[PDB]
Each structure stands twice: as structure tokens, then as C-alpha cells.
Amino acid sequence: MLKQVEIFTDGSCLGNPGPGGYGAILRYRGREKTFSAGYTRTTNNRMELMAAIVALEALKEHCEVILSTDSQYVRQAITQGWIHNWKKRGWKTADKKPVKNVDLWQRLDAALGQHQIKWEWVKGHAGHPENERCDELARAAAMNPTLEDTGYQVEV
């Protein structure tokens, strides 16, 4: 009832780097909206991040969110406060080089600022139906890609 919009996300690739896809589920006022897209060439990390972003950027109202994901990459960054680090030094590293996937981190941070979120880190699909499903969606879009991941940069 007095319920938080619920978001579940998953992203992956067939070969890293290679065609990749995402799957996200948004669950609010009795309704549930899924999203999924395939990318001709990207990385796992990128897809993991992109599912969270697309999901959140879809909320048109200040929500209270519970975001469940098995992503090691987002867990790493959140739990370790990397976004707060980066932000303070203008999104650059030691090197004075732009942070990796800065395009996506900016996007996420921008979404973090509007909502109240609670991260739920999941391990394995057992007892986690919606994550399993996001997985299927992701692997499915990854096969019939239709988008370019413009932010995807060879170099490193």
C-alpha cells in the first residue's frame, strides 16, 4: 500500500565486450512496466548500470524506491561511496582522466538526487523471480540488438 515503487534490474552481454541487453521491471500502483533494449556492442558493466538508469529515469514523480539488483558493479560503487568521491573531484581520477563510464554515472547520480532509494543486493535468482525475469529479458534483447551504445569506448 504505503508502498515504495519496486524496481528490479539486470544487464549482460554475449561476450564481453559484445552485443548486450538490459531488462528492468518497475512496479507501482498495481501496474508493472518492463523495459528492455539490445545494444550492438557494449560491456556487462555498462548494461548493469543502464538498466538502473532507464528504470529510474522513467519515474515522473518523486518516489520512494526499493531497487533490487545482483550487480557487483553498482554494489561496489554505492557501498564504497565512489560516486561521492568522483563528484567532489569533478568526475576525474588521480590521473586527471575522466572516470570510466562517466556518462552513465552522471545519469544515475542525477536520478539519485530526486528519489529516496533503498538498494537490495541480491545473490542468485533462487527466491528472486523478478531478477530471474530481468535476466531473460536482457539475454533476449542481446540477440536482436537495435541500439548503439555511443558511450561505449574501445581504448580501455
Domain limits at 118?
A: 1-156
CA–CA distance, 69 with 144 (Å, rounded to integer): 23
Classify 100 as helix, strand or coil. Answer: coil
* Buried-state track 71-110, b at ≥16 Cβ within 10 A, e below 16: bebbeebbeeeebeebeeeebeeeeeeebebebbbbbbee
- For residue 111, give the amino acid letter: A
Best CA proximity match to 46, nearest among 122, 100, 6, 96: 100
CB-CB neighbours of 129 under 10 Å: 11
| Residue list, annotated binding site | 10, 48, 70, 135
CA–CA distance, 86 with 83 (Å, rounded to integer): 5
Can you give the CATH number for the domain in which 58 is found? 3.30.420.10
Place of cell 557494449: 42
Per the structure block, which three cell numbers stand in for 37? 533494449
Distances (CA, A) of 85 to 45, 55, 63, 128: 19, 24, 25, 32
Tell me which residues are annotated as active site.
Answer: 10-11, 48, 70, 125, 135
Best CA proximity match to 57, nearest among 113, 99, 138, 102: 113
Q: Kindly give, in sequence order, each residue whose CB lies less than 8 Å from that of residue 59, ignoring residues fewer than 6 positions away.
A: 5, 26, 65, 114, 115
CA–CA distance, 68 with 48 (Å, rounded to integer): 12
Domain total in the chain: 1
- Record the resolution, in angstroms: 2.0
60 touches 116 (CB < 8 A): no
| Residue list, annotated binding site for Mg(2+) | 10, 48, 70, 135
